[PDB]
Each structure stands twice: as structure tokens, then as C-alpha cells.
Amino acid sequence: TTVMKFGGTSVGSGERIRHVAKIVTKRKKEDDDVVVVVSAMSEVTNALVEISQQALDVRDIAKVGDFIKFIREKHYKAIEEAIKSEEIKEEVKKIIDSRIEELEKVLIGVAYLGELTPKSRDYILSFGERLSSPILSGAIRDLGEKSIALEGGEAGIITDNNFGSARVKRLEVKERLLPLLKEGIIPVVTGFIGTTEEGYITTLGRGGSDYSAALIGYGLDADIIEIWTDVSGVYTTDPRLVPTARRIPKLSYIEAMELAYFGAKVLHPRTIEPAMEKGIPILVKNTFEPESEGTLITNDMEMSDSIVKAISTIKNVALINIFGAGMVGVSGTAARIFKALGEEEVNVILISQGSSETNISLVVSEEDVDKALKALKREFGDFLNNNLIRDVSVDKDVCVISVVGAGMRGAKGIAGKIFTAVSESGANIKMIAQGSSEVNISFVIDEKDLLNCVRKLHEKFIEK
Amino acid sequence: TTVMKFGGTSVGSGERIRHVAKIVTKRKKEDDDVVVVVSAMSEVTNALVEISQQALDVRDIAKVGDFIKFIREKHYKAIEEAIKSEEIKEEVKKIIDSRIEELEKVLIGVAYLGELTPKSRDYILSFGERLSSPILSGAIRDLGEKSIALEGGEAGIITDNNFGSARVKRLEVKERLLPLLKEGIIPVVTGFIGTTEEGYITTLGRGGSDYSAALIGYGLDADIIEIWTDVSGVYTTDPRLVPTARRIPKLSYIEAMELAYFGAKVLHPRTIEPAMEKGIPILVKNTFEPESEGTLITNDMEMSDSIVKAISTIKNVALINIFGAGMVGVSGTAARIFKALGEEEVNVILISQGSSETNISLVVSEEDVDKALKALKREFGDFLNNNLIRDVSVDKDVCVISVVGAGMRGAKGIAGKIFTAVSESGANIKMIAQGSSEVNISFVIDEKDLLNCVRKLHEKFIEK
Amino acid sequence: TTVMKFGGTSVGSGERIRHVAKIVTKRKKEDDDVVVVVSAMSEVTNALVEISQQALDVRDIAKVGDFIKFIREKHYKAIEEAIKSEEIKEEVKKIIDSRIEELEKVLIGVAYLGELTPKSRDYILSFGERLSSPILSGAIRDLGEKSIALEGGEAGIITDNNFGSARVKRLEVKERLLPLLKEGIIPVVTGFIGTTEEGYITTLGRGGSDYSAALIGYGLDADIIEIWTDVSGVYTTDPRLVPTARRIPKLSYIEAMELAYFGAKVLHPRTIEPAMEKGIPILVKNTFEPESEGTLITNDMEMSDSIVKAISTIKNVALINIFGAGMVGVSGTAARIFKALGEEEVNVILISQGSSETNISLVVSEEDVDKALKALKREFGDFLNNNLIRDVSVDKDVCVISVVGAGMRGAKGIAGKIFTAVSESGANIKMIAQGSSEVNISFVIDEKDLLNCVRKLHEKFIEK
Amino acid sequence: TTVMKFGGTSVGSGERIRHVAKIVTKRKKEDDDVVVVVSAMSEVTNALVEISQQALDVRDIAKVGDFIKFIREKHYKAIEEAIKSEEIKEEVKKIIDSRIEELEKVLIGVAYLGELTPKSRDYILSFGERLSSPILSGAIRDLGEKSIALEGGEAGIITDNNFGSARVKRLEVKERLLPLLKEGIIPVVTGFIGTTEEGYITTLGRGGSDYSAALIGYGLDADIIEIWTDVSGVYTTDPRLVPTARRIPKLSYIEAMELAYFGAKVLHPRTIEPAMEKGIPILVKNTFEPESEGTLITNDMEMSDSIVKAISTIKNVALINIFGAGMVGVSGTAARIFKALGEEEVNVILISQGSSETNISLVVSEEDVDKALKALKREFGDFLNNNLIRDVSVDKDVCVISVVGAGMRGAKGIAGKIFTAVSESGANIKMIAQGSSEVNISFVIDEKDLLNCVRKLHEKFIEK
Ligand SMILES: Nc1ncnc2c1ncn2[C@@H]1O[C@H](COP(=O)(O)OP(=O)(O)O)[C@@H](O)[C@H]1O
Ligand SMILES: Nc1ncnc2c1ncn2[C@@H]1O[C@H](COP(=O)(O)OP(=O)(O)O)[C@@H](O)[C@H]1O
Ligand SMILES: Nc1ncnc2c1ncn2[C@@H]1O[C@H](COP(=O)(O)OP(=O)(O)O)[C@@H](O)[C@H]1O
Ligand SMILES: Nc1ncnc2c1ncn2[C@@H]1O[C@H](COP(=O)(O)OP(=O)(O)O)[C@@H](O)[C@H]1O
Ligand SMILES: N[C@@H](CC(=O)O)C(=O)O
């Protein structure tokens, strides 16, 4: 049983979709049980995000119409360039048209109301995958193989209703997909969406298509989960930032999970857990260079000589420094800080506390800064005094660099190497986290020093 | 207005008490408003701690009697060697005898019940200072100066009733002490004790006499708070561990507060806050070398060349690693972790979190390990799962080293220097905290590598 | 300064609106500072409620169009019958048309989404007052007086964003209205709506127009708040249930507040507080019989001979009986009951507890029953046992009768009279509340005995 | 299986103890399985209460010695007058002497410490039953029957450690007592005491000996629980207040439980629950008139003609009126009121709320008033305002009268009868509770009108 997932750029045009369909069809000959997971076409999810905000804010009906036509012409051209059979094009075009009708109605409905609830957002975003999957399914049929397009929910992914980033409650992947596989059918499952208990469409978070593939793999006790993307596996760092980056042939579950979590976009962080806990390997491959061995992610762990195996970054973060009111009890005031932040669903990436004043340093998701300040003000309001917090500063022009490798925590002398290197790059360290991870050290520097810092780190540990 | 505080060893014998009385009496000529704060005689607080536990556990009435006689003979010999006037000795001996009566009754009562409540503990411990203060007060009278002995509460220190480490509620230091100063009297205020709203005797935590001095300073809007101890101020590290340690002439409030907080015993950490918030300078001096300039603690801040100005350690700590259950939300699970720890009054010194598994690293007070595990088990009990925690390990054979200096957080390259140094000492770093403090970097290593690590750090940054 | 509020029926047609405009214009000659508060036209708020639910549930676009036309024709006919000047009709019709456009877009938007958030509800409801106020303002101009129509928010009523029943945060009534009054302008402020800090339209709860008048009165330090309705003041009971009901010329703030609170619809319960705390009198008058003295509500308090001065009822309630698990501590289990109910925003009208089993009796708002049971089940789940609750029963076929009068609590023998009377009416008492109010005794009986009970109570105490 | 409990007065002298031993020995012939539960001798528990407070406060060692001798002479005289056999007297006198030794040591231990913890209180109180039980056991042996004295804990009553009123966790009554019964032994179990998991002596609350009997009955699946006291069953009211009171032959569990709960001292309220839930009947009998049929408490329920079957009072209560801050939400503020009161373990007997100001009326245990105010002040501190509470008044000169009977809640017209009757007695009603109980109506009047009110109530409903 092989589940194969294809990203945005991998299906960025009709030609590429056909190319993908060929890849899938070749696997069908090696393993007869093949399930496909497909993302929205290149750049459409972003367009759906921004039209959602436009329909809400400016409320221009003709700007919606402009959008619909951009979507129509992108997917029409895709159908035309991916499928040869006229009968099949005609079949796929109809499905696409039903989707565009619904999309149009909902965007107009949003404009008419001037309201865009989290539920409506998810519905709108799901159209990306619901428009691309039938085109790929059709192209697979066009190559003489049986295929139907399915949505995440009907493929067996049931979530709660925390729209925007629903968490998985329940799987019925066997129940939904096994009958189809038995008939020899290749299901093309929509990437980043699932369903509520009552059938409401739900998204799993940006980059969530990867996670879908892992869920389906998990559900089906698959032999392998294949991640097909636009680079040949997981590299020593992001090859679009540092072009001398090198493919890492083998990586462990925890190494990959930490990298993904800390900014190696190639994998959504939630991809690893389901595969990890059933020992299903993950093979990351390049659709544009399908001959490459890529990266195999399993249980096996090997330490590297220089120890640091890879470097990831997150640009979209803010450093929040909470200033405590003195010797007021760190666990007590941390209890209240994280209750407030947790209530507001603020996503904290990093914590450090080591201060006689009960100060604490946090890294949050940058877009969560306003929710965070609002939450802290609600909780604390405004030395003999009973007060716990004194003030709070934010720095948004900041980033998190992480360094990941097999024996990181245990490796004598590596911290000093990493930090002298950081210094020599011209960066000033604002925060360090070490201790909570077997394989990871993260730190915070100014956003402007990102590129230079990553390069120096790459030079010292990977290139030599 | 000058408040002068004298430590345990400073009054470790009658001869030393007389010497201290001379020091005070010489200040009386420079400033007419002098208040003394005095600790229990050398080693008696410890003896009181251990007799409390013996009276509770083994319940031996004659072992209590052995203790009383040790206390009687230590303080009798002190009266005899500190005071010349027979009339005054006879006067001080009576006060001491009233105290010994009460001490004896309470220890026997403890043995009879087999119960030692936090309230009873504090009462027993307070005897140290309540036995030493009248001896010093009598020695000050013996030198022809007016003096009476006071207890913390009646000197105006009012606390809550969290026995063991009561926090200050309210000050009436002006109201209680001003009338006495106006009459030209030198009050000898007992060190580490205060009073509940209803007059129950309360202790301010071990090493609390320093804090009393700061409180009385704060209350009286004093010109200076003098800490008289057995070393000539604050040193680059603990001079009893690394004898090449150097006196630091000048230190800022925050620098001193972090060092104290992180194990420079010379100052209780709570000493700084009251002095800091009123800009009252703190002068640390050696009673055994009273000519030394010592250390002046004020607002002034000067960066050092090598940046690290001092090194402190805490031996009595444990590393607690809580293992999370995956991608379960760090602020949500941190809210529950610290709620539980905060409820159990567990004292956490250090936090670090940087882990896709939602692991967190904490440093706690070592004696608090059992309270901590009990609290975590109560809170969490025992990936589609809803569980937040997976497991929790403790390592007690561990210490915290801190490095303190004016421009620490901002100083380019210092982390790398510190950590390469740590490595070269043969130490393995288990945890790092950096970011939450302007002047401090703390890390955790094995207990066995403490001495070697401090030496190497001292060599590189202080000696060169 | 006079604020005059006019209810639904008072402006139930164009003819009535003109009649109201005349009333206002006559006041303008007695006091030059007049502010008007106006409800939605008779029956339209109810129509807006029900179209909201239809647009959500059935989602029929033509049923929305039917509604729009009903609204259009009601308000067009009103403009035509209230205003003589063609130029003014033309001016008011345009404002009405802008409102109907917005109304239509929003209802369609609701139907397209199948979502009706509390925010959307409030926006939709607000159209009642936003459609009636400009018609009244135009009629006031038609009589040669200066007037403009304002919305609650822009008139200075700022609320939180608890949509459905927003509570007032802040008033800027002076700042917004004083400039307009200085120019001699009569502002016609929309009744039951206010605004969020960010300008989101908000409602104050059903019957809220009364409360708006009191707020505006409070904000302006008005000399009088006039409530113009369809009865001549506050009567001994609801004159539509018991036609022998008598006008009460004078009533105290607390007497009126209890009656309103307990079902005398003539005043929203929140009307009294702002007027009470600034000692601004409330004059309740009949728009259809404007010569009647009505009811004056002030600080003055006079006891009546028979003590009971008035009877109110609430039909829309449920009796909830929580059965406790024995001697489990009433305050402890009450703490948990009311936490759960408070969290779910369940409105409890009455409490009684006097039971060895820790049973408690509550009266809630009937529509809140489901929220209540859901909250209790969440809190308690399912004699040596630790459990606090045993079971819980509901009775919806039930009502609350209250009896209000100046010296009620203190009056010897009145409870016995009230209850023998209740008995003789054929009613069976399920709950009694007495003690917490100076002027009120409330009890619970079967819904079917309401009419008979009120009559007997009215006969004995009012008619004799 | 018959458990027989004997109260304080029932064993108020040696003569009475022998008389009780005869009663037991006569039952032994009708049922071979007899367990005895015995209270402390008349008036000694009270003496132990007051000596506990004296030893703590004044700390007079000779006042303790006076007490010991009073206890010694009371129990010596008892041994002498209850037992004939010299060998047995000698045997029982030794047990008594071991108890007096322990008692003496503990009281002196308290004086020496000046501390009386809840744990020490319970230990001291338990001596009453621990001194009386061996005397009764010896008297039972003196009549040629086998008997040993046991303590509550070792008889199988295991509690938590909430000293003063520990609640039962666990029963091992079968395990401890069955072996003894099989040997034909009559165990004399101490009344109102149990044991902690770790063997710490614990009391079940004043009047708890009744509850012990019920627990032992429950544990043993007894056929009957017999309550032997100084009146012939449960009367229509307290026969020492109203001498025309009449024995009620038959009463249901719930009727008896409400009466006990509301002041019919004859039964501790907790007696009913264990007997009720296993359908074990309770027979209340007079030891001084052992031929009377007394009162049988079972499941059977019969309505009386006049409906009110009995009247109970609690003198030791206070009325607390919390004044709310207006329309601030009753369940929300009730949540916070009862949280605070529940935390402080304040015992609330009665609740009533029916007020537009969010006032609430409570009845608490009078000794709990200070705890209650301290709790409310801690929770709330000190109309646009956010505040929930306005003020709070207490009235200690107040009592609760309850009226109990089979069909109370359902009975048409009874409330009116009760309350006109109350009025005619000259009482003024401050609070009414009705609704939460099937069989009970409670109200609050001035303490001074208690006697007169009870009389009038008794006259109208019982005597006619
Ligand atoms: N360590 C890394 N190894 C490989 N690719 C990385 C790494 N870090 C970041 N990337 C980026 O991830 C991109 C592929 O991920 P993504 O944009 O999500 O495509 P897909 O549509 O397949 O999800 C690559 O273009 C690369 O720039
Ligand atoms: N940085 C430091 N400088 C000086 N002394 C230190 C430092 N760190 C720890 N100490 C220890 O603090 C001691 C003085 O404090 P303490 O033992 O509490 O005596 P006191 O009774 O005067 O408080 C010295 O003996 C010294 O060894
Ligand atoms: N005790 C009472 N006295 C007078 N009117 C009452 C009383 N109780 C209820 N009402 C009802 O309140 C109605 C007026 O209030 P309402 O229906 O809100 O109209 P509006 O608020 O629009 O003027 C009257 O028609 C009357 O039946
Ligand atoms: N309703 C009632 N019926 C009978 N006795 C009552 C009632 N209410 C109170 N009592 C009192 O209860 C007393 C017996 O109980 P108590 O004083 O607890 O003695 P014991 O030691 O037997 O428990 C009687 O002396 C009587 O005055
Ligand atoms: N199409 C979604 C999901 C994915 O890319 O995997 C996104 O833009 O994030």
C-alpha cells in the first residue's frame, strides 16, 4: 500500500498534472494499492486567502468576478493540457463548473453580509484542492487507469470544528478507501481538508496536505508515505536561500519533526507523528527529478561527525519579553501567563526563563502578537505590592534559527561551536533554548542577520 | 540614617560580638541614627533546624535537654566574653533564660505531640536571633551607648502567615523605630523574623537577615544599608571555592540581584528589591577586615572588558525533564504544568522549551522534587489520544552555573566564549537559559563538574 | 433637559408617528432641550427576528424578498401618512431605501452562508429602529422644528461585544448630543442599539429602548426621563390580563425595578438603575391618552394599607430542581452549580435551598433549559461516594408570580395572607422566595393557574 | 443482627451503665448477633472541649490536673457502681488509667506548646468514648456475657483527615466485627470516632455517635439499628421546650432526615443516609422507659390530616444578607459567593434569592460568621462599574424554624396556614425557603420569638 502526495508546484499546470499522473500510473505497476493525495494548484490557495479578505473588507462584486475568471481560466487550461480524451475533459469540466458555481455564490454571500466566519474561510479555502483533484483523477483515467476524486472528510478524516486548524478526532480511512482499492481504483484524495462530525468542511492548517498523506497512511497501515515536492528530499537547509545546500539521504522521525517544526517547509510538522507511531517510512521525492533517491525518514538514527546535520529558520515570529515584578514566584506567574496565552490560542514556539525578576522570554507566531497582548492585559490588568507583571515588550523584526542533529543535547562542545559561529556571522543572540530536545538547539537573532547567520552555520558544519 | 546588619560568623562568639559592638559604636559618631540588624550566632539556626526534626521524629526528651545545655553554654560564654559590666551581664542573662525556658517548653511540647507544624517551626527557629540580639544590645550598652533589643514584628515587619517563607505585607518601621532613634537609642533588631497580623512569629526564609536589613532600610528611608559579613564584599565568585576570587568594588542592583538569586550566598536575593526601588545604596563589608572598601551596590552600571564579571552556582537543585505527548500545544500544556507546580508551591529556577514533542526542561530546588512529581501526577493522572504528558524524568546530581555581567544579553560573541569554555572544562551542558535577563546566562551541568567548570570560567574571564 | 422615549405601538403607523411628533413639539415649548428615543414600529422587531431564523434555516431567497416588500410597504405608507412636505418625504424615503438595500444584502448573505452569528443577528435587528427613527425625525421637521436621526452608538452608547445583550461600557452622550442641542436640534436616537469600541452595531436586549432612554438621561444629567407607551403608567397588574387593574400614581425606584424585573413589561428592568443612581425621575405616560398623570418614579416611598401594591408575572420560565447526593456541603455544590450555569450564561431568576439532601430549586428563562442541562452534565458528568449531584428534573409548564410593595419584608402577617390567597385561587405552590428583597415576594405555580392566581391576588389586595 | 446505640445520659452514671448492660443482655437472648455503640458519659465531651481551649489559651498546668481528677473520679465511681466482680473492676480500672495517662500527657503537651491543632482536638475528644466503652463492656461481662471494647477505627470506620468532622471514606465493619460475633462476643464500639488511613484518631462531628451506629449497621447489613436515648422516640417537637409534645410512632427516612438536619437533636442528620440506602429500619427508644414502642423509621410514608407532623428549630445560626450591585447576573455572582464560602468550609443551611439587585439571603452556622465575612472580603475586595457585591449585613439574633411532613410541597394551602400561624405568634419572618424539599418548609425569625412561635405552630397543627 502506497500513498503518494503531490504539492502545489508539482501540479502547477496541466502539463505537470499529466506528468504526475504518469508517475502515479508507474507506481500502480509496482504496487497495486495506490492512494493519491493532492494539493491545490500552485498559488491558488493564496489567491483564495486574499479574495476572502477582499470580499469581506472592500465588498466589490466585480473584483469577485475577476477572481472567478482567473480560477476558471487556470483550471480550464489545466484540463486541456493534462487530458487527451474529449469525453473525460467534458466530464472533468462539469465538476470544475459545479465548484466554481459554489465558490462564486459563497464569495458573493460574504460580500453581501460583510462577514467572514472561520467556518466560511475553511469552506472557501477547500476549493483549491476540490478543483485540482478531479483534474488529476481525470488525467489518471486518461492513462487507462481507474480513478475517482474524493474529499478529505469522505476519505475518512474527521476533525473537531476548530476551523482554520481543526485537529483530527477520528479516522475511517480503511472503511472509506478499502472498498475502492479492492475494485482496483486509485483514489485522489484532496489534501488539506477534513470534515466535522456533521459534514462541515474543515482545514488542517497551511501546508496541511503533507499531514493528510500521513493520516491516510496511518489509517491504511500503508507500507510507505511518499512526499512529492519540488526538491529532492530534505536538504541541509532551504536550497532557495543557500544554494550550496545538500540532500540528506536518511533522517530519523524526530530529526525531521524538529526541522519541520522549526521551519523546513518541505514537511508540515504534523506529517511525522502518525508515520512515526506506526513505523511507516516517509520518502520525500522531487516530482521534477523523479530519479533522485531523495530522503528516507525512518526510525534509524546515525550521528554525524560535525553533529549539526541541518539548519532551519522561521521568519514570521515575534520575540515577546514579559517583565516580571520581582521575586514573585516563577511557576505561579508562569501559570497565569500561559493560561491567558492558551485561552487566546496563542502559539508559542520557544520559552526561556532565568531571571531574579521573574522575567520570561517567549517566541510567538507574529500574527499572534495582538491576541497575546490582549490576553495578558485581560489577565493582569494594570514590592509590598501583590502585582506579578511589570511591563511587556515586543520585537517583531526577529527570527528563530534552529540547528538539528542526532546527538545534539549530549554532544560535548557543540553549543560553543554553534554560538561562536553565530557571533562571527555578525548576529546578536536575543534568546537561546537548549535542553528540552534531544536533537535541537534554537536561538533568536535580528531578522536582518538571518541570511548571513544561516550561511556561516552552513559553511562551518556542512561544507567545511 | 544607617542600618548595619551583622551575620552569623560576625557574632560567632562573645569576643566577636564585642568587636561588632565597637564597629557600631564608631558609626554612632559619624551618623547619630543607627539601627542594627543581627543574625543568630554562628551555627545555631542549623542546630535549631535539626533539633526540631529530632523532637518530632525520635521524640527523645533527654536529647532535647542536651540541646538546651549546648545553647545555654554557648550564649552564657558569649555574655561573659562580650560584656564587662556585671550589672549588664546579669540583665542579659535573665532575658536569655526566659528564652531558653520558652525554647525548652516548645521542644518538649513538640515531642509530646509528635507534631511540628510550619507555625511551630518558625517559632523555634526565631530563638536564634532572639538569643543573640540581647547580647549584642548589652555589649553596645557596655560601651556607654543606649540600646534595646527588638523583634522583627515589633520593629514593624508585618507578614502574611505562610510560615517558613512569609512574604512582607506591610511596614511600620518608621512608627516603631523613630521614637527610639529620637531618644538616641540604637535598636538591635532581630534578623530573619517578622510577625503575622495577629502577632504570630514568622521567618523570612534562610539567609533572611539580609532581607530584614533592606526592609528596615526601605522603611526608614535610610541613607545606606550596610551588610557586614565574613568576606570583603561581593567577589568574582565564592572565595571559599576559588581562592583567586577578586573583590568587585562596584556592582549594580540588577547584577547583584541576579548573582544572589543564582547562588552568591553573601546576599539573600530579596535584599536588593527594597534598596533598589528607593535608590538606597548597599555596602557589603567584612567584619573581620573592617578597613576594606568592600562592594558598593547602586544604580550605576559599567560594562567590563571581558563582560562576565562574576560566577555563581547553586548545588541544591534538580533537573526535571517533562516529556510531552507530541504536537499538543505548548502554551496549553505549560499552563497545566505550572498551575500544578504553583499550587504545590514548587520553586522553579529555570525554564527552557524548544521541542516539537512539547517537552520542557525545568530546574527546581531539589527538596521540591517530591512535591513536583506529586503535583504533576495529580494534574495529568496516567496521537489520536487527548493526553498532554508522556513521562517525566529527574536528575538530582546536577547544578546551575550562572554568569553575570552588565551587557550580557547584548554582547556579541559572549555565549560562544562561555560555552566553549564550559566544554573545555570537561562539563556536559544539559540546559541553557539566555534571553530573559539583561545581565545573566545560566546553564546546567553535572554536579561533579561544578568546581572544574567554575575554575575554567574564572580563569578565562577574570584572571586571563 | 427632557428625554422622551416612544414605544412600538406608539409609532405603529404614520398617523401615530405624526401624533408623537406633535407631543414632542409641544414639549419643545416647555423645555428647549429635548432628546427623543424611538423604538422600531409596532411588530417589526418580531418580523426581523423570524426572518433571521428563516434565512438561516430554510434559506429561501424569495421568502426574503417577500419580507423586504412587507417592510418597504409598511414604512412607505408610514412616511406618506406622517409627513406633509413632499421635499421631506423624498428625503426620508431615500434614507429608508439605503436601509432596505443593506437589510436585503445581509439577509441574502445569511441565506448564502447558512450562518447567523450573534453579530449578524444584532445587525439585522437594529434595522427596526434605524427605519423608524428617520420617519419620526422627518415628521418633527415637518412641524417646523429642527431634527436629525441618530444611532445609539453615535449618540454615545458604547457597549462590549456580547451580541444579543451587550452591556454598557461607557457613555459619551454629552459629547455627542450637547453640540446638537446647543444648535436647537431635537435628536431622534434609535432605541435598543449601541456600538462596540470598533463600531459594530449591538443590541441591549428585548425591550431595550427603555434602557436607552435611561442611559441618555443619565449621560445628559437630564431633569426627567419620559416613558411614552400604550397604557397610562404602571398599573396594579398587567391591564391586558386583569382589566380592573388600577394606575399607580407614584412608585419608588426599587418598587418599579422589582416589578419590571419580575414581569411588568412596561419598563425594561435596566431602565431604573441609571435614573435611580442620579435621582432622575421617570414619568411613564400613555401616548394614546397624553392627558393622564401616569406614574412618577422617584426616591419617595409610601407604604400602602394592604401592603401589596402590584402583581407581576413571567410566563416564559422553567423550574429546575437539582437533586443533591445527600449531606455533601451546600456551599461547595452550589459553587459548582452556579459556576457551570454562569459559564453557559444561563439566566437564573430565583433560588431556594433548604434541604438535607443538598437539593436546590432554580427558576431559569425557559429557553435556557438546554444550555443549563448541558452545563450541569459537563460539570458533574455521570454516600461513601464522592459525587455531589444525584439527578435533575425540569418543569417548563410553570410561571413566576411576584408581589411588590413598600414594606413587604418587614410587614407582619403578609406572607400568610398572600399564600392563603394563592391557595384559594386553586394554585399549588412549587417554590417560594422571600428574604432577599425589601419589597418583593415571588413564588412558582403551574402555568395553567396563572390567570386565576393573579385575579384572586388582585381582588384581595387591590379591589377589596 | 442488631446494633444498639446508647447516648450520653443513658450512660450518665454507673447505675445507668449497668441498666444499659441489662438491656443489651436481654437483646442477646432474642438475637445472638448484637453490636453496641456507646457515647461518652453525660457531659464529659463538653468538659473535654472546654479543657482543650483552657490548656491552649491560659496554659494552667494545675487546671489540667483539676480536670484529670474530675474525670478520674467520675469514671472510678462509675466502675464501682456498674460492676460487681472485683476482678473485672480491677481490669477496667487499668484500661481507664492508661487512658487518663495519655489524656494528661496530651493536655500538658498542648499547654507546653500553646498549640491546639485540629488533629490534637480530635485526639482529646475521643477520650470520652474511650473511657466509657470499657466500663460498659465490663458491665456486660459482669452479667456473664462475652464483650470487648473497640474504637471506631479498629471497628472498621475509615475516614479522611478533615479533623473535627471527618467524612467516611471506607468501611471494613464486616472484616473487623464478624470474627468477634462468630465467637459470640458483644463488641462495644466507641461512638463518634473513626480512623485515618494511617491510624490517626478522628471525630465525626458533634452528636456523631448516632452516625456511628448507622455506619456499623450499614457495614454489617444489620436487621435493625436501635437508637437508645432519653426520650421515647421522635416527638412532634422538642419535649423539653414544649412539654405537650407527642411521640410519633412511625416516620419515613426523608421526614426524619429533614427534622434531624433542621434541629431535632435526637438523631444526628447523618444517621439516616446509610440506613436509608440499605432499607435498614431505625428504632428510636428511651433507655429510661424501655417499654415504649418509640419511633420506627422506615420507607413507609403516610400523610397526616393537618400535614405538618413535626417542628424543629436551630438556635445557633446567623442570617447573612449579601447586598448585590444591581443587575449583575445572579448565577455569576452566586458562583463567586459560594466558591468563597465553600473554600472557607462555611456551612450554609438555607438560601433564598429573588431580587433585582442580586441580593441573596443565607443562613449559616453562627460560629461560621467570621470565616464567611473573611471569605467574602477575600473574593470581592472593596452601575458602569464592574463590581458584583455592594455590602453585607449579619444578624446573629435569629433562628431557623422548620416544619416537616409527608406531603408538604404538594399540599394546597399549607404555606398560608403555617405563615398566618407564625404571624399570630408575634413573630416577624425574615426569610422563607420552600420548593427544594418534598417534606420541609423552613423560615427565619428573631431568636426571641422562638418559643412562642413553636408553641403556636404546635397548637394549630398537632393539638388542635
Ligand atoms: N531543509 C529543507 N529541505 C528541502 N526544502 C526546504 C527546506 N527548507 C525549506 N525548504 C523549501 O520547501 C519547499 C517545498 O515545500 P512547499 O513549498 O510546501 O511545496 P509543496 O507544494 O510540495 O508543499 C522547497 O521549495 C524549499 O525551498
Ligand atoms: N560572590 C561571592 N562573594 C563573596 N562571598 C560569597 C560569594 N558567593 C558565596 N559567598 C559566600 O557567602 C558567605 C557570606 O554569607 P553567609 O555565609 O550567609 O554569612 P552571613 O551570616 O554574613 O550571611 C561567604 O562565606 C562566602 O563564601
Ligand atoms: N404592571 C403593569 N402596568 C402597566 N402595563 C403593564 C404591566 N405589566 C405589563 N404591562 C404591559 O406593558 C405594555 C407596554 O409595554 P411594551 O409592550 O414594552 O410597549 P412599549 O415598550 O413599546 O411601549 C402594556 O401594553 C401592558 O400590557
Ligand atoms: N423532635 C424531637 N423529638 C424528641 N427529642 C428531641 C427532639 N428534638 C430535640 N430533642 C432532644 O433530643 C434529646 C436527646 O438527644 P441527645 O441530647 O443527642 O442525647 P443522646 O446522647 O442520646 O444523643 C432529648 O433530650 C430531647 O430534648
Ligand atoms: N493548499 C494548502 C495545503 C498545502 O499546501 O499542503 C496550502 O496552501 O497550504
Ligand SMILES: N[C@@H](CC(=O)O)C(=O)O
Ligand atoms: N539565621 C538565619 C537567617 C540569616 O542568617 O540571615 C539562617 O541561618 O538562615
Ligand SMILES: N[C@@H](CC(=O)O)C(=O)O
Ligand atoms: N426593539 C425593541 C422594542 C422596544 O424596546 O420597545 C424590541 O422589540 O424588543
Ligand SMILES: N[C@@H](CC(=O)O)C(=O)O
Ligand atoms: N461525644 C459525642 C457523643 C454523641 O454522639 O453525642 C458528643 O458529645 O457529641
Ligand SMILES: [Mg+2]
Ligand atoms: Mg508544503
Ligand SMILES: [Mg+2]
Ligand atoms: Mg547569609
Ligand SMILES: [Mg+2]
Ligand atoms: Mg418594550
Ligand SMILES: [Mg+2]
Ligand atoms: Mg446525640
